Design a protein around this ligand. Structure first.
Ligand SMILES: Nc1nc2c(ncn2[C@@H]2O[C@H](COP(=O)(O)OP(=O)(O)OP(=O)(O)O)[C@@H](O)[C@H]2O)c(=O)[nH]1
Ligand SMILES: Nc1nc2c(ncn2[C@@H]2O[C@H](COP(=O)(O)OP(=O)(O)OP(=O)(O)O)[C@@H](O)[C@H]2O)c(=O)[nH]1
Ligand SMILES: Nc1nc2c(ncn2[C@@H]2O[C@H](COP(=O)(O)OP(=O)(O)O)[C@@H](O)[C@H]2O)c(=O)[nH]1
Ligand SMILES: [Mg+2]
Ligand SMILES: [Mg+2]
Lengths: 428, 49, 432, 430
């Protein structure tokens, strides 16, 4: 009764959204046929957060797989846990679209959206206490972060206080996997910052260096980094399905987290991860894990924490702990690190301690920080529009459908409106 | 007679360069033609990790 | 279901198009008679109820000597005999005899076959035409087949791969005439019009290989693989896959620039791949060594605008971006300033596949690179200095006059290539 | 780990290169076709298990490279490294640097790009050459000026063969060994030098070998370069890197020409009866007889002496062996270097190559010495340049292939400065 309605969109979010259901179903004892196999008691009694229940003693997810190109949905139907879903809500079409924002909100995504949202309407109007949404997308293309604004715009027209929980993969600094990426990423910032409340921003570059340094993996493929993102997926949902000593829903993890209505972007992180060689050599505690939470390397989005002050760090703990150790050792990280937190907030941290941790170690953790230092992510992308815009580069596709240059100038300021306010509030 | 002329006598001259065939690669490549010869297996990394 | 329509016009593109369907049926299990002893192959093929498999390509050329070697040849048991359109007498290599006079006859027949195939198709993605520049029926005819599709159909991409006229060698006289006819028409409705040349494949064949005297046969298999490393992202599921319509936007910066180059990286024999180490960090800059390329040109006088490194085979994506930034830190690989880090990747899980009897070795990896470059305008400078010297004396006009060409349209097309020469000198300049 | 790239030029170096890789393989455990039935410094590795060495061979004649593509070692090298021109440099610095050289210098450099773009940490280019003729001296001159410009600061070490005081196989050889100083002065960092005729008398008195070919002289030089690169591949009590050498051996940057000596060079029939302790073969390096260059050490003074010991050696026997040398009076040391020496120890003993004439010995010393007394060896080499260039003899060939006439006399005064830069430091300061 702290519910979440799920969706997938784009190629990048479809995979990690599919690799969401690998992690959550192992926690809860479900078999892909839908038989409860877990021996522990507590896996069942809050299962309706993410799941409907199927008639005949069987279990079934609560999500809608959609994207415009049909290879990916047909790839997951042949996947590991493909046969769990409901076959009426696969809105997949054989047709395609060429990463253009214009057609996907005015012509080619307009035919699709009623069939898209009438099953987000179905699973919600037969619900008890709906509380949030979960849409896995990525910031770049005309299909991922194009359609992220399509599947959020008509929602807030009716839902008054429901808290959306999306997850977005940012453009990396050094490399590129789309030429026309600033020309489509800032196009969604016109609507997402108005409406989203959680976007777990992710760099692809920082995901490799955790694998290179801590994990000592030379070759992190795509079977790795989804399984690294997937921990902070089901790490924030500990006080939504489990008992615990300090409980909070997605709203309390917004009233604490959100200070002003447009600075609401979350940085992931999973503490007790180590390579196989030095795993015996390392002994973990509540003092030891709090290093790996507050380490400079265990952040899935690459920024420099030593170039900004944290607004609200909220690290969720999971397992059996001492809770002086929770509070005395999350002040020692604030006392010793003085100038790198805001002076106009007296206590900058908040814990959350659970009673059953996710599987893999005794004493798991997950650290979520809302810094100020992610303006350097914002500076580069907003620069990459305007210094490429001094020649009027790619407008002859989008102006076939009415994407005038009066739009693309003013949405760049709505990126730089965010830059001006971190500079307004870094020196306060 | 064409086979005898182009096999016995004519083998000495054009042995370096044929028409659409590269060379007599057999004395150089100590392998088999059906074997797989690249840099290395990344399946080694896949099995290790 | 993601399908594609092929046409092959002219003995340049037909004979390479004969050289592609071996490589497509050798990936799968289909024998030449069409019986396969899977929902992937619907890109290029189809199925009839006897277990036979039937392709998606139509073969047409006015001269009948190269289509009739296939019907008599060992590959007739594959196609549709109503697709194979033969003819009477060719176009004199003369534009108004591939377009205006003799070219007109077979058109309503042939355009009712891109109509027939697509009417039983689910959702279509583009075309795979195969022509060449300096022809007279490889230029006049494919002009007319391109102004009838998109005028009638509309909003679908076009993917033909031509052969550039070399700046040194050629096998006609009337080719500086003949080029400026098909680069009028590829400018006004073609959206992805690739190219290679006959000359650079000769000199890959000397250094990377060691095959002196390259025939016609060994050239066409290499041009098959570049296509079959591009077009095999529509039948193979992979980590990073791109639609045909999706690179109709991200490549073309301004309407004019849609002619990039191509490069297959580990072209090698069995006696060097046994020695060489061809892993990911060195077969990705071999596409930027000045040797391995498909125009006899100097790359270092140009800046590579939008490189789309399509990989395939057994690779992992840490090894890509470690090697992507290794290029831009190198000072020799100079880029366009205003565009971003221009690189662009794509990974699949299907190896190179060797058609037997060739000189190509078994490698576990392959890179196809599509590189828009500044360095092609110099080759476009030479092909009008090859043109105007005729037109100072007005040589050979009277045959084109004899079939329907005016005098003045040879200057209309040259100022239209003054328009394409001036664009690389107004977008290659620095924006300040 | 740490890597080194080897390039051999000319008739001298390529013949030297086949002698060292006959013994570099036998240090390790690989068959000569590159197969095996810590050494990552010199061999890259395909997944199949072929040991490809790091080498770019070059010559302007096919007649010395074609016995590598057809010899036993054809399976070892990658056949895109054996660089081969069309016609020789005709023993001309004019042809080997100006006319014939600039058709291959794109390919030779862009191969060196392709061996250095996969090594982890690169520190030394074992370039091999000679001061005899055209390609050995002149192509190395263009080869240096393209490496250091395009690579920067990675330290090179060259090995050379010097013209003898009397005994040589050329006429115009002073015209190529004065003009080659304009490329081993500036860009190359050290140049380890042995002249040919001094090896010959060592091959007559110590080894009782009459009529030695160019194989036995190439085996002996094989056991010096392998002694330099022991500390790269086999861990020891005191290892010495390549960057260790150049700041421990060169006083002033126009003086990099150290000599070489090998101590236990004795035959198999007399090795049994003599034990070779390190108190007696330390003396055997400093003999005027056993020196592998004919410049008399007791004419002048010693500058700085580097030692390299291989095998069953204990360190305080070495320090007892060092201090007994400074206390003598005939071994004259330079006045302002009280330190005098530099040492090195490694555990793997020297390994005899089959068909070799050296004996299997548990101890060995490599020796390096800047001397003040090789200044006479430049005194008779500028004279043999002075004798012919009085009447402009033989210059009409080099001039017509792209040289000016003043370029020859520009090099003689530059060699007049180097003899004075090497004699002004010889006086004891006061
Ligand atoms: N790659 C390849 N190119 C070819 C082949 N045969 C001819 N060509 C090229 O085709 C060019 C001539 O232009 P084409 O377009 O083929 O002439 P055409 O318009 O087709 O007219 P036809 O004579 O009927 O074939 C020559 O310069 C050749 O380089 C071939 O078998 N393979
Ligand atoms: N130590 C040693 N010196 C050699 C050997 N062979 C030749 N030399 C020297 O090489 C000098 C002649 O120069 P080379 O390098 O052999 O000939 P070149 O200038 O390269 O001319 P080409 O070989 O025809 O290209 C002579 O003075 C010899 O002293 C050898 O096997 N060992
Ligand atoms: N982690 C992960 N990232 C992916 C995957 N597929 C694509 N991406 C990322 O998606 C980015 C490109 O933007 P994209 O999501 O494709 O835009 P879209 O075409 O609308 O989906 C690239 O930088 C990739 O890193 C995947 O399977 N796993
Ligand atoms: Mg023809
Ligand atoms: Mg020589």
């Amino acid at each position: 009764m702290r519910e979440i309605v799920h969706l997938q969109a784009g190629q990048c979010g479809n995979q990690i959204g599919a690799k969401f259901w690998e992690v959550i179903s192992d926690e809860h004892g479900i078999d892909p046929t839908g038989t409860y196999h877990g021996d522990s008691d507590l896996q069942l009694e809050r299962i309706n957060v993410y799941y409907n229940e199927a008639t005949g003693g069987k279990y079934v997810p609560r999500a809608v797989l959609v994207d415009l190109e049909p290879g990916t949905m047909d790839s997951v139907r042949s996947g590991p846990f493909g046969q769990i879903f409901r076959p009426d809500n696969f809105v997949f079409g054989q047709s395609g679209a060429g990463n253009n924002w214009a057609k996907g909100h005015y012509t080619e995504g307009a035919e699709l959206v009623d069939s898209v949202l009438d099953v987000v309407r179905k699973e919600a109007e037969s619900c008890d206490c709906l509380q949030g949404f979960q849409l896995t997308h990525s910031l770049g293309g005309g299909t991922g972060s194009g359609m992220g604004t399509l599947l959020i715009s008509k929602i807030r027209e009716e839902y008054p206080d429901r808290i959306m929980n999306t997850f977005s993969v940012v453009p990396s600094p050094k490399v590129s996997d789309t030429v026309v990426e600033p020309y489509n990423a800032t196009l969604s910032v016109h609507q997402l910052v108005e409406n989203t409340d959680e976007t777990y921003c992710i760099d692809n570059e920082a995901l490799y260096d955790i694998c290179f340094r801590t994990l000592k993996l030379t070759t992190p493929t795509y079977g790795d980094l989804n399984h690294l993102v997937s921990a902070t997926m089901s790490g924030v949902t500990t006080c939504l399905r489990f008992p615990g000593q300090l409980n909070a829903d997605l709203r309390k993890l917004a009233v604490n987290m959100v200070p002003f209505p447009r600075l609401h972007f979350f940085m992931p992180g999973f503490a007790p991860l180590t390579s196989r060689g030095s795993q015996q050599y390392r002994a973990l505690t509540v003092p030891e894990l709090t290093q790996q939470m507050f380490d400079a390397k265990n952040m899935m989005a690459a920024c420099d924490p030593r170039h900004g002050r944290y607004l609200t760090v909220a690290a969720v703990f999971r397992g059996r702990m001492s809770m002086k150790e929770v509070d005395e050792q999350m002040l020692n990280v604030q006392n010793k690190n003085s100038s790198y937190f805001v002076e106009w907030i007296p206590n900058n941290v908040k814990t959350a301690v659970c009673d059953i941790p996710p599987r893999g170690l005794k004493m798991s953790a997950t650290f979520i920080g809302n810094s100020t230092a992610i303006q350097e992510l914002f500076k580069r992308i907003s620069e990459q529009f305007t210094a490429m815009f001094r020649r009027k580069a790619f407008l002859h596709w989008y102006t076939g459908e009415g994407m005038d240059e009066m739009e693309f100038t003013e949405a760049e300021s709505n990126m730089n409106d965010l830059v001006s306010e971190y500079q307004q509030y870094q020196d306060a | 007679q064409k086979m005898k002329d182009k096999k016995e006598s004519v083998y000495f001259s054009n042995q370096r360069a044929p028409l659409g065939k590269s060379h007599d690669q057999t004395p150089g490549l100590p392998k088999g033609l059906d074997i797989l010869n690249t840099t290395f297996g990344t399946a080694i990394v896949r099995e290790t990790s | 279901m993601r399908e594609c329509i092929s046409v092959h016009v002219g003995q340049a593109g037909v004979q390479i198009g004969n050289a592609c369907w071996e490589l497509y049926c050798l990936e799968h299990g289909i024998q030449p008679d069409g019986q396969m002893p899977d929902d992937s192959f619907n890109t290029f093929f189809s199925e009839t109820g006897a277990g036979k498999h039937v392709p998606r390509a139509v073969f047409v050329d006015l001269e009948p000597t190269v289509i009739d070697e296939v019907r008599t040849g060992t590959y007739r048991q594959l196609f549709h005999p109503e697709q194979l359109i033969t003819g009477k007498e060719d176009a004199a290599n003369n534009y108004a005899r591939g377009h205006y006079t003799i070219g007109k006859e077979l058109i309503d027949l042939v355009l009712d076959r891109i109509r027939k195939l697509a009417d039983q198709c689910t959702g279509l993605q583009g075309f795979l035409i195969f022509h060449s520049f300096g022809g007279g029926t490889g230029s006049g005819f494919t002009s007319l087949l391109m102004e009838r599709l998109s005028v009638d159909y509309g909003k679908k991409s076009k993917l033909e791969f031509s052969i550039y006229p070399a700046p040194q060698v050629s096998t006609a006289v009337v080719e500086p005439y003949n080029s400026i006819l098909t680069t009028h028409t590829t400018l006004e409705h073609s959206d992805c019009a690739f190219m290679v040349d006959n000359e650079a494949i000769y000199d890959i064949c000397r250094r990377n290989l060691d095959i002196e005297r390259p025939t016609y046969t060994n050239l066409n298999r290499l041009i098959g693989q570049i296509v079959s490393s591009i077009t095999a992202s529509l039948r193979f599921d992979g980590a990073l896959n791109v639609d045909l319509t999706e690179f109709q936007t991200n490549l073309v910066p301004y309407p004019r620039i849609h002619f990039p180059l191509a490069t297959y990286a580990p072209v090698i024999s069995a006696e060097k791949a046994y020695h060489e180490q061809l892993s990911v960090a060195e077969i990705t800059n071999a596409c930027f060594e000045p040797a391995n390329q498909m125009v006899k040109c100097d790359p270092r006088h140009g800046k590579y605008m939008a490189c789309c490194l399509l990989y395939r085979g057994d690779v992992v994506p840490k090894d890509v971006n470690a090697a992507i930034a290794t290029i831009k830190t190198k000072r020799t690989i100079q880029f366009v300033d205003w565009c971003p880090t221009g690189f662009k990747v794509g990974i699949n899980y299907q190896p190179p596949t060797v058609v037997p009897g060739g000189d190509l070795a078994k490698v576990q990896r392959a890179v196809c690179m599509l590189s828009n470059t500044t360095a092609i305008a110099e080759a476009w400078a030479r092909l009008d200095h090859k043109f105007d010297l005729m037109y100072a004396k007005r040589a050979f006009v009277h045959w084109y006059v004899g079939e329907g060409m005016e005098e003045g349209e040879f200057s209309e097309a040259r100022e239209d290539m003054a328009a394409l020469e001036k664009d690389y000198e107004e977008v290659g300049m620095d924006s300040v």
